């Protein structure tokens, strides 16, 4: 009591720093005794300590006097009346800028990150107002996770909080009791299943806990279940000869399949059989394949580089014109003394002007200012100002050169200069099969559309002419719109030749230099299909077909062309297979338009008739491999969402359709209203009511078989406005194309959407506030209503608009408040109802993933809910770890799945490679709750609890609130208003109509959700058990138990022999079995998809197909990915990603010769970026299959072992000696002394002298390669340290990598930034330096001992030897992968500890936490900051099984 008060009073002024502001509160704290005053004073002072401590740490003046942002502005004389009311903790005002500090200390990660995000939002809210006011904000907040501060030592404040803690308990004993703010204090600091909350579970968690027991008998005996199965069957079978449907499951006659495929689309694709006819149609389909097959046939051009480099500084209408005189002038002193697209002088910005609008812009810009006297008045000032951007940031020698061309300008020369060159089909030679220059023109008519996002805003014939380079002759483009949007391009040649078409540049990266990879992919393919029936003249037929197909697919990329060629895998899987759904041929049909797509149809049918036509069962394996690969040929299209909005409406629709047929209850409340209880009552009642003849596609579980399942697990047998309307209304008669007006009317979602509170609603609303800016606008609309009456005292929309807007006006007409930013956390769990944890109710939001076929749904929710959901998704994971069938993240189980699959398939037993359908929207947390609160787990107080925590996190998920994404609701309201003002309305367009007759939807909340991926381990658990039960029903009825597996949305069922003899013997039984397994799954929530099969030789478990024995390689699958995945990074890492993906590729059977070609393509891309190819950039382009038994180390060593062939012959026996005498008896530390890494690399000399024989200074000094990251990393502290710290569009990536890597990127010893150009030329021309190439410039072949005026600028200090970086590597490669890496032709914590074993960097590597030779290899890795010798195996997973062509293990070194 009194003793603690006295202790505090004597502790505040005797142990805390004496500050002017702190004293004000210190004295008042000392002057009180009553507990409530003591607490408030102590808490406030504890707040102020951190407040001013962090404000001074930032250096921004603290807001002690509670000065407002407006006050902070006005104390400096800045008058901006009207601003968001904010009270920054620390502020520093300057002439035109502001620094605001918001500070807070939070213990729990969740509350910390929360307060972080809304503090960022609060700062960003006033961003535009601060900017337009003439100042700017310094964005910064002080997120501290501790109380250590300058004003007090740690022990002082720690004991302080202890005393306040104990005095809280004393006060809580007294009548200072606080309802739950007492909790927010105390447990707010004075994972694993937080149970410290109260329990308010009343009158709702009892009905829900009752429906899970009303009807079920979870204890049935061990032989009272058999009698139930035998009476659920044979009550089905006898209702199959008349009742439902013949099983949806029929057999296959391959000819029937092929003919049914052929007769698809009776309408327009109507059996155009003749090959030549099809190809003739093909070569004429779009407008672009009409060129790709057509058979057509430096003083300037550098001045643009200079005229362009000085362009990013300024860009205005008055500019870019006299920036073009400096170019047209250059076009007259080079043709008179003697490109140009015939009226157009290619000006700065890829722009193109008219030679006649110029030469008339002057003479009225110049004349407004004796014209010949007025000559040179601007052509000289421009030179002077551009040269004003001098060696300032290294303005290079290009400057005086222009002083020769430009000053030749005269008004007797600009009388005709543009008047001199006054000059303002093709066909389709089809024989362009197999002609490498028919794709080699795509590989250059895409780079002229790809490097076209690289234009800028830049404000007739104003057309952004790029250049189609090619051998010698060059064409153009002509378009008018930039960005990543669509526009109508053109081409131009020597004759006009408007080959107009319409495409999207983002889609065209795949062929951007790949002319020799595709032509060998499509050539290897046809090396599989050298088959006996086709040896007649059809190989040419197939070859022309396949090439004319790949051309269409690359040349006309679009979603349908992907979904189609993807679906053509199901048909072939069926043709080789032996049963199949009967509703299949409606799983293949699209709405083909755009004759390209129809011709793709015809080509596919031609391929299928040819290969799968007569003479079957002779080489079907090869034909199957061929065709599945042609199926995967779909990946060549980019997976990048053709449009955004029309790919959000689709995702929302795919979410919201089943809810249309079940129930939804738009926009619930935070407190579950009676209506929600009624609707959930009804939905549970229906969900548990599904008779023994199910509607076959609707969510439901039948409480007569569900009882059997739960009871067979519990038994031990299956184991082992008044302003809104007015604002729109006044402007309506103030705004009087009209589609902008339609937008204006559809901007009306303010008198219909005002939901939630929090953050729901996400510019002209504020613009009218500043636009009007009149005297009295914030009171009632009395004046506004007066104008409307006094006014009246493509036009119908205006009158009904006044009718609507007149309609609108008629119908429309204390706690720790300050210490909130301080230790007190406002929100946190407390007493929780059965709906939610009292802070919220498990909010969510959905967006689409990006995939090949169809965009897949994704649920993303804020971090607290992502913390809670982790508890369920881990409890169920640990649960299923006891059962041995699932395979989702149990990776060790996948290998056994593969082994069993192979042992099965090898013999001829079935594989019912099913795939379930609508797995997202046909599962409900209710079902897992039913399944759990009915299981009978063992002894209590350690299982019996945590069950009542999983089964109350689930009950939380039940009532989630997904969000209607804002663009979707905007679009649907547009559609509604368009329809109403002025059919084809899909179902989800009518619900908006009813509700917007009343109130808008915002949130949707229903039982059948199972957020895709959210509970994706709970789903796996359920599926595993259900399959383990159905494969018991089938066992008791028919007589065999077929094993299964699962992924959470895939499956398999490897029936044994006794259920495989029947298909050959009698299919009329196994047909019934595949009907019954498809029926019970219907009773439960498992709906088998029509894409399933039961192939006696085929399989498909998570996309790893099979054939008798071996695996279908899926060549095109991996090639299509390696040719992608080129991301903007450091090229020494961009070429790491590919050297991983190529190892992945050669894991499966991509042949080595295509791998080299992929690598050559990537190197060629870099070389196009103008980036020197130092020998460590991308791996050897001469590879044995040696991707096995070799790390990246071995490739790079092998490269240096041939880029300098006989120098690296001595430094390989020196290393032999070093390794011979390092492991056994010596160095092990003194080698770090001889590493000498502090100083220069004479180490080679002293270390050759140390133990070994003659070694000249040549083999060391001579080979020396330019290295860009020598002294610092280059702009856009070792490497392995950064990686360990890290373990605490794609065609607008390249179009950026080629922009930054050419500019000032490299850095110097004194933070100086240089180009690659000057640095790469000086080493070649301006020294006794020899800089010749070997396919990669190993600059400065000599650098004699580096005896020189060293550090000239940088180009001599900036280049390190080679035969040393060969030594350190060719050592690291000798403990990691054996001894032979010299002879002539493990995990994170470890590495952290052996990094600590030299403790100096641990001081930086430690605080981010909230063997025999490994020391040496870690050292060598830490020094060599370029590749990976250790840090590799901890970033990129290697592969386990390797098989590649046996004709590559024969050509080996
Ligand atoms: Mn599958």
Automatic annotation (TrEMBL):
Q: What is its EC number?
A: 2.7.7.48, 3.1.-.-
Coiled-coil intervals in this record?
A: none
Reactions this protein catalyses: RNA(n) + a ribonucleoside 5'-triphosphate = RNA(n+1) + diphosphate
What's an example of a GO molecular-function annotation for this chain? metal ion binding
How does the cofactor bind to this protein, according to its record? Answer: For endonuclease activity. Binds 2 Mn(2+) ions in the active site. The divalent metal ions are crucial for catalytic activity. For polymerase activity.
Q: What subcellular locations does the record give?
A: Host cell; Virion; Host cytoplasm
| Cofactor(s) essential for the protein | Mn(2+); Mg(2+)
Annotated catalytic residues: 115
| Residues the entry annotates as binding Mg(2+) | 1050
Q: Where does Mn(2+) 1 bind?
A: 51, 89, 102
Q: Name one GO cellular component term.
A: host cell cytoplasm
Which residue ranges does the record assign to the RdRp catalytic domain?
Answer: 899-1088
Q: Where is this region: Endonuclease?
A: 26-278
Which keywords does the record carry?
Cap snatching, Host cytoplasm, Hydrolase, Magnesium, Manganese, Metal-binding, Nucleotide-binding, Nucleotidyltransferase, RNA-directed RNA polymerase, Transferase, Viral RNA replication, Virion
UniProt-listed GO biological process terms: cap snatching; negative stranded viral RNA replication
Task: Specify where it is mainly localized.
Answer: host cell
* Binding-site residues for Mn(2+) 2, renumbered to this chain: 89
Known partners and oligomeric status:
Homomultimer; the oligomeric structure is essential for the polymerase activity. Interacts with nucleoprotein N. Interacts with protein Z; this interaction inhibits viral transcription and replication, Z partially blocks the product exit tunnel for the releasing nascent RNA product.
- What does the record give as the function of this protein? RNA-dependent RNA polymerase, which is responsible for the replication and transcription of the viral RNA genome using antigenomic RNA as an intermediate. During transcription, synthesizes subgenomic RNAs and assures their capping by a cap-snatching mechanism, which involves the endonuclease activity cleaving the host capped pre-mRNAs. These short capped RNAs are then used as primers for viral transcription. The 3'-end of subgenomic mRNAs molecules are heterogeneous and not polyadenylated.
Q: What else is known?
A: Classified as His(-) endonuclease since it does not have a histidine upstream of the active site that coordinates the first cation. His(-) endonucleases display very low activity in vitro, although they are clearly active in vivo.
What family is this protein classified in?
Belongs to the Bunyavirales RNA polymerase family.
Reproduce the free-text note on domains from the UniProt record.
The N-terminus contains the endonuclease activity (endoN). The central region contains the RdRp activity.
Report what the protein is called: RNA-directed RNA polymerase L
Mapped onto the parent protein, the portion here is 1 to 1814 of 2210
């Amino acid at each position: 009591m009194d003793e603690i008060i006295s202790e505090l009073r004597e502790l505040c002024l005797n142990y805390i720093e004496q500050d002017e502001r702190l004293s004000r509160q210190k004295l008042n704290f000392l002057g009180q005794r009553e507990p409530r005053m003591v607490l408030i004073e102590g808490l406030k002072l504890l707040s102020r300590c951190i407040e001013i401590d962090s404000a001074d740490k930032s250096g921004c003046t603290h807001n002690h006097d509670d000065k407002s942002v407006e006050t902070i502005l006005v104390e400096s004389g800045i008058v901006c009346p009207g601003l968001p009311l904010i009270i920054p903790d620390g502020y520093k005002l300057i002439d035109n800028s502001l620094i605001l500090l918001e500070c807070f200390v939070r213990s729990t990660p969740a509350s910390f990150e929360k307060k972080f995000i809304e503090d960022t939002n609060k700062l960003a809210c006033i961003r535009e107002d601060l900017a337009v006011a003439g100042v700017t904000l310094v964005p910064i907040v002080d997120g501290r996770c501790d109380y250590d501060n300058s004003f007090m030592p740690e022990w002082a404040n720690f004991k302080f909080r202890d005393l306040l803690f104990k005095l809280l308990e004393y006060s809580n004993q007294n009548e200072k009791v606080f309802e739950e703010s007492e909790y927010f204090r105390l447990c707010e600091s004075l994972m694993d299943s937080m149970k410290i909350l109260k329990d308010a579970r009343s009158t709702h968690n009892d009905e829900i806990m009752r429906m899970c027991h009303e009807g079920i008998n979870p204890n049935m005996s061990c032989d009272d279940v058999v009698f139930g199965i035998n009476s659920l069957f044979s009550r089905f079978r006898r209702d199959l000869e008349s009742g439902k449907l013949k099983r949806n499951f029929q057999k296959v006659n391959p000819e029937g399949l092929i003919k049914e495929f052929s007769e698809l689309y009776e309408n327009l694709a109507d059996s155009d059989d003749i090959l030549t006819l099809s190809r003739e149609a093909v070569e004429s389909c779009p407008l672009m394949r009409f060129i790709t097959a057509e058979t057509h046939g430096t003083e300037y051009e550098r001045l643009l580089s200079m005229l362009n480099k000085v362009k990013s500084l300024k860009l205005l209408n008055t500019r870019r014109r006299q920036l073009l005189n400096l170019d047209v002038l250059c076009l007259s002193s080079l043709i008179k003394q003697s490109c140009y697209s015939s009226v157009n002088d290619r000006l700065v910005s890829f722009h193109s002007t008219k030679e006649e609008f110029i030469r008339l812009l002057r003479n009225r810009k110049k004349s407004k200012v004796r014209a010949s006297i007025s000559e040179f008045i601007a052509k000289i000032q421009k030179c002077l100002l551009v040269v004003g951007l001098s060696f300032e940031h290294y303005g290079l020698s290009e400057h005086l050169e222009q002083e020769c061309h430009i000053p030749f300008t005269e008004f007797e020369n600009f009388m005709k200069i543009g008047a001199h060159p006054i000059m303002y089909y093709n066909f389709q030679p089809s024989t362009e099969q197999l002609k490498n220059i028919q794709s080699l023109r795509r590989l250059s008519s895409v780079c002229l559309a790809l490097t076209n996002s690289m234009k800028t805003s830049s404000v007739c014939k104003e057309v952004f002419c790029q250049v189609i380079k090619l051998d010698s002759e060059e064409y153009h483009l002509l378009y008018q719109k930039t960005g990543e949007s669509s526009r109508c391009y053109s081409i131009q040649g020597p004759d006009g030749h408007l080959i107009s078409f319409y495409a999207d540049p983002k889609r065209f990266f795949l062929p951007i230099f790949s002319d020799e990879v595709l032509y060998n992919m499509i050539d290897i393919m046809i090396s599989w299909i050298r088959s006996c029936p086709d040896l007649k003249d059809c190989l040419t037929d197939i070859e022309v077909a396949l090439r004319t197909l790949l051309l269409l697919m690359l040349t006309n990329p679009t979603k349908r062309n992907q979904k189609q060629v993807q679906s053509v895998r199901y048909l072939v899987m069926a043709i080789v297979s032996d049963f199949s759904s009967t509703s299949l041929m409606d799983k293949l049909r699209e709405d083909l338009i755009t004759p390209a797509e129809k011709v793709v149809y015809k080509l596919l049918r031609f391929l299928i008739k040819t290969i799968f036509g007569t003479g079957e069962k002779v080489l079907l394996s090869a034909k199957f491999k061929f065709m599945l690969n042609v199926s995967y040929l779909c990946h060549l299209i980019t997976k990048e969402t053709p449009d955004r909005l029309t790919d959000q409406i689709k995702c929302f629709e795919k979410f919201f359709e089943p809810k249309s047929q079940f129930g939804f209850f738009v926009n619930p409340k935070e407190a579950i209203t009676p209506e929600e209880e009624c609707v959930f009552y009804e939905q549970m009642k229906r969900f548990t009511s599904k008779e023994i003849d199910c509607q076959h596609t609707t969510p439901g579980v039948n409480l007569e078989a569900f009882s059997l399942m739960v009871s067979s697990f519990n038994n031990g047998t299956l184991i082992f406005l008044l302003v809104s309307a007015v604002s729109q209304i006044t402007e309506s008669f103030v705004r009087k194309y009209e589609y902008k007006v339609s937008k204006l009317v559809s901007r009306l979602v303010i008198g219909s959407k005002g939901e939630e509170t929090g953050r729901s609603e996400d510019c002209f609303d504020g613009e009218e506030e500043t636009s009007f800016f009149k005297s009295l606008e914030e009171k009632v609309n009395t004046t506004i209503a007066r104008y409307r009456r006094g006014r009246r005292a493509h036009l119908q929309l205006i009158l009904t608009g006044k009718m609507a807007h007149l309609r609108k006006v008629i119908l429309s007409e204390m706690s720790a408040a300050l210490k909130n930013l301080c230790f007190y956390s406002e929100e946190s769990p407390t007493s929780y109802t059965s709906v939610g944890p009292d802070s919220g109710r498990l909010k969510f939001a959905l967006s689409y993933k990006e995939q090949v076929g169809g965009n897949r749904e994704l649920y993303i929710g804020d971090l607290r809910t992502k913390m809670f959901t982790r508890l369920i998704e881990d409890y169920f994971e640990s649960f299923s770890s006891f059962f041995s069938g699932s395979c989702l993240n149990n990776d060790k189980e996948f290998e056994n799945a593969i082994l069993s699959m192979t042992i099965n398939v090898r013999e001829g037993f079935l594989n019912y490679s099913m795939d379930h359908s609508k797995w997202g929207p046909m599962m409900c947390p209710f079902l897992f709750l039913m399944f759990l609160q009915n299981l009978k787990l063992g002894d209590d107080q350690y299982v019996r609890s945590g069950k009542d925590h999983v089964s109350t996190l689930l009950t939380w998920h039940m009532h989630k609130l997904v969000e209607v994404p804002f663009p979707v609701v905007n679009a649907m309201m547009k559609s509604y208003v368009k329809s109403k003002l002025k059919e084809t309305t899909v179902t989800e367009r009518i619900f908006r109509q009813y509700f917007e007759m009343g109130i808008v939807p915002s949130h949707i909340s229903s039982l059948i959700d199972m957020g895709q991926g959210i509970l994706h381990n709970a789903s796996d658990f359920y599926g595993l058990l259900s399959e383990r039960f159905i494969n018991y029903c089938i066992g008791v009825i028919f007589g065999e138990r077929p094993e299964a597996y699962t992924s959470s949305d895939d499956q398999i069922t490897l029936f044994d022999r006794r259920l495989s003899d029947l298909v050959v013997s009698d299919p009329e039984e196994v047909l019934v079995l595949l009907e019954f397994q498809s029926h019970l799954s219907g009773l439960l929530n498992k709906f088998i998809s029509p894409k399933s099969v039961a192939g006696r030789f085929a399989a498909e478990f998570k996309s790893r197909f099979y054939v008798w024995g071996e695996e279908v390689p899926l060549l095109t699958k991996f090639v299509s990915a390696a040719l992608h995945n080129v991301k903007c990074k450091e090229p020494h890492q961009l070429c790491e990603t590919i050297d991983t993906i190529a190892d992945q590729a050669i894991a499966n059977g991509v042949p080595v010769s295509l791998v080299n070609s992929i690598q050559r393509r990537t190197l060629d891309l870099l070389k196009y970026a103008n980036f020197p190819l130092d020998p460590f950039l991308l791996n050897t382009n001469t590879d044995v299959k040696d991707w096995l038994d070799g790390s990246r180390g071995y490739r790079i060593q092998r490269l240096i072992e041939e880029l300098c062939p006989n120098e690296t012959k001595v430094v390989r026996k020196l290393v032999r000696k070093l390794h011979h005498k390092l492991k056994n008896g010596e160095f092990n530390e003194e080698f770090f002394l001889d590493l000498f890494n502090r100083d220069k690399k004479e180490a080679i000399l002293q270390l050759g002298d140390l133990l070994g024989l003659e070694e000249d200074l040549n083999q060391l000094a001579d080979v020396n390669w330019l290295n860009l990251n020598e002294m610092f990393p280059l702009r856009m502290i070792p490497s392995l340290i950064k990686t360990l710290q890290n373990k605490l569009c794609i065609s607008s990536g390249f179009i950026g990598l080629c922009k930054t890597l050419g500019s000032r990127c490299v850095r110097n010893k004194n933070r100086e930034n240089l180009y690659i150009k000057k640095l790469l030329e000086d080493l070649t021309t301006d020294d006794h330096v020899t800089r010749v190439c070997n396919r990669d410039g190993i600059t400065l072949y000599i650098c004699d001992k580096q005896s020189h005026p060293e550090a000239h600028r940088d180009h001599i200090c900036l280049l390190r030897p080679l035969l040393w970086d060969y030594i350190c590597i060719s050592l690291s490669n000798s403990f990691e992968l054996g001894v032979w890496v010299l002879a002539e032709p493990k995990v994170n914590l470890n590495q952290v500890i052996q990094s600590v074993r030299r403790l100096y960097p641990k001081i930086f590597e430690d605080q981010l936490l909230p063997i025999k030779f490994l020391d040496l290899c870690v050292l060598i890795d830490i020094n060599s900051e370029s590749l990976s010798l250790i840090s590799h195996v901890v970033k990129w997973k290697r592969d386990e099984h390797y098989t590649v062509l046996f004709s590559d293990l024969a050509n080996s070194h």
